[PDB]
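Researcher: We're reviewing a set of sequences before deciding which ones to prioritize for further study. For each one, I'd like a predicted 3D structure that I can look through quickly. This is Thaumatin-1. If possible, include the structure in token form so it fits the rest of the review sheet.
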Amino acid sequence: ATFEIVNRCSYTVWAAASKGDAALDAGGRQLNSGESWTINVEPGTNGGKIWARTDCYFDDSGSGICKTGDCGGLLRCKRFGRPPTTLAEFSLNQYGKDYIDISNIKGFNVPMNFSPTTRGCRGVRCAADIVGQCPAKLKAPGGGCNDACTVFQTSEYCCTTGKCGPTEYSRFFKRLCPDAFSYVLDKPTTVTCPGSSNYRVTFCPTA
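Model: Here's the predicted structure for Thaumatin-1, in token form for your review sheet.
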């Protein structure tokens, strides 16, 4: 499948793509404002994620650090990034269907549109100013808005026992972005697409 990753933000982001134990395509790249990066994701990929990283600096060998979404200090991510990270999530070719969603379970750093470029399903979007409105306890110094599990490490926020309810913190994310997961047992906002669809992820889709 092909994913076009577009940075419509006025600031540079460092895109990342991983399935947790391996990079997808090159795994990461700088995107200046307006730049697009097309990657190929092999069919049958389960549990892939795309996210933006902000305020990175990398050296020659591609080692460095980012203030949001850092994946062990590498430009080319092999593993998932450090929260807060707005997440585009996907599983491809699962019994003939693709499944996509946007998740705030790991916090929010950059607004995001996640849409198919082929037909047969709708896109999803979380483009509200969650950083500006972020509750004081969840604000991350480096930028972004942490989820409550990351901050407080309780069974309720992290849904460790496999049961948990919505919280004052999850309700904040859900009120600003109803189409994104706000906690792990949220009513699913997953979208079902035809198997082998193609997609575009747009950072800062509105502004």
